[PDB]
Design a protein around this ligand. Structure first.
Ligand SMILES: [Mg+2]
Ligand SMILES: [Mg+2]
Ligand SMILES: [Mg+2]
Ligand SMILES: [Mg+2]
Ligand SMILES: [Mg+2]
Ligand SMILES: [Mg+2]
Ligand SMILES: [Mg+2]
Ligand SMILES: [Mg+2]
Ligand SMILES: [Mg+2]
Ligand SMILES: [Mg+2]
Ligand SMILES: [Mg+2]
Ligand SMILES: [Mg+2]
Ligand SMILES: [Mg+2]
Ligand SMILES: [Mg+2]
Ligand SMILES: [Mg+2]
Ligand SMILES: [Mg+2]
Ligand SMILES: [Mg+2]
Ligand SMILES: [Mg+2]
Ligand SMILES: [Mg+2]
Ligand SMILES: [Mg+2]
Ligand SMILES: [Mg+2]
Ligand SMILES: [Mg+2]
Ligand SMILES: [Mg+2]
Ligand SMILES: [Mg+2]
Ligand SMILES: [Mg+2]
Ligand SMILES: [Mg+2]
Ligand SMILES: [Mg+2]
Ligand SMILES: [Mg+2]
Ligand SMILES: [Mg+2]
Ligand SMILES: [Mg+2]
Ligand SMILES: [Mg+2]
Ligand SMILES: [Mg+2]
Ligand SMILES: [Mg+2]
Ligand SMILES: [Mg+2]
Ligand SMILES: [Mg+2]
Ligand SMILES: [Mg+2]
Ligand SMILES: [Mg+2]
Ligand SMILES: [Mg+2]
Ligand SMILES: [Mg+2]
Ligand SMILES: [Mg+2]
Ligand SMILES: [Mg+2]
Ligand SMILES: [Mg+2]
Ligand SMILES: [Mg+2]
Ligand SMILES: [Mg+2]
Ligand SMILES: [Mg+2]
Ligand SMILES: [Mg+2]
Ligand SMILES: [Mg+2]
Ligand SMILES: [Mg+2]
Ligand SMILES: [Mg+2]
Ligand SMILES: [Mg+2]
Ligand SMILES: [Mg+2]
Ligand SMILES: [Mg+2]
Ligand SMILES: [Mg+2]
Ligand SMILES: [Mg+2]
Ligand SMILES: [Mg+2]
Ligand SMILES: [Mg+2]
Ligand SMILES: [Mg+2]
Lengths: 180, 88, 228, 131
RNA sequence: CGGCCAACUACGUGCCAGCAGCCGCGGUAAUACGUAGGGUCCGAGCGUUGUCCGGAAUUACUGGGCGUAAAGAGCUCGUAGGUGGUUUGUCGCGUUGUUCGUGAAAACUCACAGCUUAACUGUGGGCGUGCGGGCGAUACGGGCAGACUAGAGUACUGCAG
RNA sequence: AGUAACUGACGCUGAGGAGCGAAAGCGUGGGGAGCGAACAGGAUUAGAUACCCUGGUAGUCCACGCCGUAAACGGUGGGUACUAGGUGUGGGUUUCCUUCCUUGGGAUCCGUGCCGUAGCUAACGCAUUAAGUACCCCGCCUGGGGAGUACGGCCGCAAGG
């Protein structure tokens, strides 16, 4: 089960000595809803071929989201492409607050609570690149502590330890219910 | 430009000791001798702008050194300015 | 552990490098010193890296991995072809088709075509076609047989890729990192170290050292093949 | 001119991290020394030791690298600088990297880390964000 | 009820009569004009109009740039101001170190309670993000009370232009 | 550049202010070969008040004053610290194959060309002489015309700035 979405459809054109040659380009985002993200950019002369190319490229290119239970770990300032997209977690149930392309990519990621803002070049392609880079910039507390050579309690806050323990207990309960 | 004879004469004659050379007293002495000599030259040579640049640079340098002397000690500043007979 | 000895390596001149006009400063921590404008490779880290490569290759061959041999320089073509045809392992020695490992579904059709052409030629039908297209098909036999040696025998896609002289063979290692396949290659004084996962210090420009390194890795592969 | 030793130190350290260097030599000072001390205590750096030079004391800092070569330092930036000096009260201690980073705060005890500073309830000027 | 923007077909005139917040729509066969139906939104209110903030990171302290899109003054000397190369010493005027001491009422936020619930208000908290004095600290961030030199300058010899 | 004898926080940038400044232009008094705005003719074109040809007055030269603008460009302010190289040039100290002749080899600092990593940038591109990563201060920009213009103020004899 994968989540599919389309963000923008553009009628690109090419010129020859005879006249105008039209073409179609599409960008799609694929995700499993658990924290696995794939982006695809596909070009054709017709929408079905375009979306097929986009889906294939997205299937080729994947990326994993290290989310804590339901939300993001820490605020991230994703500076890439030409747009500035700033992501940070929030209180559970607040919702994934983001623009169009960011909305699509985060919903395909499966996150449920995020605060986002795009600060320039509202173009969908650049926004998607900036969000992907923002997720790449994300760091996870366990291997952050491993890199720093200091144990978890001496690195990460007790509140996020409590949240992680609650998330682990909920995941264990869900696994038990699914097995039974 | 000053040469060895008069320059060593000046550094010794306004020196605190017979060995020190970089003292502010000797520095100001060299700057003053240079400026009077070459100002006498520029009283004849009028349109030497590249040398008037040297005038202004050495004078600002002098002003910084005199400010340092006044800051570090009022008595030495007054003695220096009185022995050279200038205004400031 | 190692098989080749220090005096043998020195005699083969595996420690040499290029001139001072070609070395990239990414080899500073591998280069020991310079004499007569020629850079030398560092022996002890060379041994550590070849030992790690030996461990990796024995592991992958024991677990059943496919390793493609890559080398196109005029000096090493014969050596790589000979050792690969004796060990029975797929190799590429003359022409590297762009993205043949990445774009495998396209070259699979032409492997099918070449096998079909071999089957039809072995039947003996030559006078049933005009001599013009007979000559054309013989020429395309020559071309494709000359440029395609390893995909005849690999089929089932590789598990590791081994390359010589990566600065000229950047296409193969680039495809290898793009597909995620582990890379083992010889890095000279002018090569990027992050390109190869398991670098093996040495010379691609000296036939003695090239032949010895290829024989050592072929012996490792043979040992793994007996060890399955 | 040479006008900010702490910013110069932070920039040289993060430039060395970007350039994958291992050892950096800087002029020694108490601020540099105890900042290196708190860096060692938190574990972002490997180790430091002082030396003697042609003129005065100098401190060398060895960067930290792991088996997989990824940087042990993500980025540095200074918030309190000559001119714009920013300070924090006892309740508005800055949160860096969602609490996963470290802010260096000079309190009545000294240059101490933000978490234990909030534990003590003490506060002051934030030196830099290290994450 | 063209796309932005959840809501389409027919009938009547065709660069006319007309729409409109941006793109923009009629030159005989308009989902953009007028009429019909049909659907959408809202509702005892429905739209238009005007003022103010947000998106506008579009005045960028947090949080912008100056090669070509807007920008380095023609370039120096240099006054007032702003900022300082090490470590050798007090007072604590930049400052945090805790406590008692103000923060009118009202409003905001949390919980309680009453008008049948509704506005409305009924009680007690809490809130009331600033500023006053007495008591307890000295790591950075200044003046002040003494020494050294990694910036700078001088001093000795040469140097090319 | 070398020795580093001495000064021992004197350093930096710098709003207003002040000094220098391509060519052309102006006053006075000289000079004036060549060149050459303006202006005459000859030539082309339907048309030339231009491109072309023949002449030549300011100016171009000198001294004293003036105006103070250039695509005044590296279209990038200065200063400091750090960050991989290769190839030429200039200046100076050293040392060693040593003939001790030799761009011989090596070390060092300053200046100036070219290509290139990581990095930055929307791209071209920059890349230790950064547009790289920062610190200090200063000027400049907030859609295109209107308009670098009117009025007002300051400078200049005026053109004008
Ligand atoms: Mg940025
Ligand atoms: Mg924007
Ligand atoms: Mg926008
Ligand atoms: Mg001279
Ligand atoms: Mg509609
Ligand atoms: Mg709609
Ligand atoms: Mg009609
Ligand atoms: Mg209706
Ligand atoms: Mg508004
Ligand atoms: Mg700031
Ligand atoms: Mg801004
Ligand atoms: Mg511009
Ligand atoms: Mg300019
Ligand atoms: Mg100007
Ligand atoms: Mg002062
Ligand atoms: Mg007090
Ligand atoms: Mg009190
Ligand atoms: Mg109080
Ligand atoms: Mg009250
Ligand atoms: Mg509110
Ligand atoms: Mg009640
Ligand atoms: Mg209340
Ligand atoms: Mg408020
Ligand atoms: Mg001060
Ligand atoms: Mg002494
Ligand atoms: Mg000195
Ligand atoms: Mg000379
Ligand atoms: Mg001494
Ligand atoms: Mg200076
Ligand atoms: Mg200044
Ligand atoms: Mg100044
Ligand atoms: Mg000013
Ligand atoms: Mg000014
Ligand atoms: Mg003047
Ligand atoms: Mg004047
Ligand atoms: Mg002229
Ligand atoms: Mg002139
Ligand atoms: Mg005139
Ligand atoms: Mg005149
Ligand atoms: Mg005259
Ligand atoms: Mg003439
Ligand atoms: Mg003429
Ligand atoms: Mg006449
Ligand atoms: Mg004429
Ligand atoms: Mg100008
Ligand atoms: Mg010029
Ligand atoms: Mg400038
Ligand atoms: Mg600078
Ligand atoms: Mg240099
Ligand atoms: Mg790169
Ligand atoms: Mg880029
Ligand atoms: Mg470069
Ligand atoms: Mg630079
Ligand atoms: Mg810039
Ligand atoms: Mg006009
Ligand atoms: Mg204008
Ligand atoms: Mg006026």
């Amino acid at each position: 089960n994968y989540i599919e979405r389309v963000v923008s459809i553009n009628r690109v054109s090419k010129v020859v000595k005879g006249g105008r040659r039209f073409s179609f380009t599409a960008l799609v985002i694929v995700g499993d809803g658990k924290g696995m993200v794939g982006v695809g950019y596909g070009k054709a002369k017709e929408v079905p071929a375009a979306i097929a190319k986009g889906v294939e490229e997205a299937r080729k290119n994947f990326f994993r989201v290290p989310l804590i239970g339901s939300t993001i770990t820490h605020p991230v300032q994703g500076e890439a492409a030409a747009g500035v997209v700033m992501l940070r977690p929030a209180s559970p149930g607040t919702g994934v607050i983001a623009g169009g392309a960011a909305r699509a990519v985060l919903e395909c990621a499966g996150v449920h609570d995020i605060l986002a803002k795009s600060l320039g070049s509202d173009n969908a392609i650049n926004v998607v690149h900036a969000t992907v880079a923002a997720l790449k910039l994300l760091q996870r507390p366990e291997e952050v502590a491993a890199r720093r050579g200091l144990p978890i309690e001496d690195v990460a806050p007790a509140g996020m330890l409590k949240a992680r323990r609650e998330s682990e207990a909920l995941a264990a309960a869900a696994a038990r219910e699914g097995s039974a | 430009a000053l040469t060895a004879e008069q320059k060593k004469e000046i550094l010794g004659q306004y020196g605190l000791h017979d060995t020190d050379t970089g003292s502010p007293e000797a520095q100001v002495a060299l700057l003053t001798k240079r400026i009077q000599d070459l100002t006498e030259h520029l009283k004849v040579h009028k349109h030497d702008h590249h040398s008037r640049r040297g005038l202004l640079l050495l004078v600002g340098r002098r002003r910084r050194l005199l400010k340092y002397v006044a800051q570090v000690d009022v008595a030495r500043y007054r003695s220096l300015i009185e022995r050279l007979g200038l205004r400031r | 552990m190692a098989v080749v000895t220090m005096k043998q390596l020195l005699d083969s001149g595996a420690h040499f490098g290029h001139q001072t006009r070609r070395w990239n400063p990414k080899m500073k921590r591998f280069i020991f010193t310079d004499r007569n404008g020629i850079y030398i490779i560092d022996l002890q880290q060379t041994l550590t890296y070849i030992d790690k490569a030996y461990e990796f290759v024995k592991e992958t061959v024991a677990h059943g991995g496919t390793v493609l041999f890559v080398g196109t320089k005029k000096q090493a073509q014969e050596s790589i072809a000979e050792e690969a045809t004796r060990v029975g392992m797929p190799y590429v020695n003359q022409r590297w088709l762009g993205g043949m490992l990445t774009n495998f579904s396209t070259v699979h059709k032409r492997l099918q075509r070449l096998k079909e052409l071999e089957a039809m030629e072995q039947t003996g039908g030559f006078e049933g076609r005009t001599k013009k297209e007979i000559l054309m098909l013989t020429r395309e036999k020559n071309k494709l047989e000359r440029s395609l040696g390893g995909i005849r025998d690999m089929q089932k896609v590789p598990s590791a890729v081994w390359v010589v002289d990566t600065n000229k063979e950047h296409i193969a290692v680039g495809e290898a990192r793009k597909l995620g396949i582990p890379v083992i290659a010889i890095l000279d004084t002018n090569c990027d170290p992050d390109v190869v996962d398991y670098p093996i210090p040495g010379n691609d420009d000296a036939i003695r050292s090239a032949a010895l390194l290829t024989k050592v890795i072929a012996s490792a592969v043979a040992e793994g093949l007996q060890a399955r | 001119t040479m006008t900010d030793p702490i910013a110069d130190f932070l920039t040289r350290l993060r430039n060395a991290n970007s350039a994958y260097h291992d050892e950096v030599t800087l002029p020694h000072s108490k601020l540099k020394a105890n900042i290196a001390e708190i860096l060692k205590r938190e574990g972002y750096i490997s180790d430091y030791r002082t030396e003697d030079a042609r003129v005065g004391k100098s401190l060398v800092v060895q960067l930290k690298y792991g088996p997989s070569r990824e940087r042990s330092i993500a980025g540095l930036r200074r918030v309190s600088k000559p001119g714009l000096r920013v300070y924090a009260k006892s309740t508005n201690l800055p949160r860096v990297l969602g609490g996963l980073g470290v802010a260096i705060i000079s309190t009545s005890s000294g240059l101490l880390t933000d978490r234990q500073a909030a534990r003590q309830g003490v506060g002051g000027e934030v030196l830099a964000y290290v994450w």
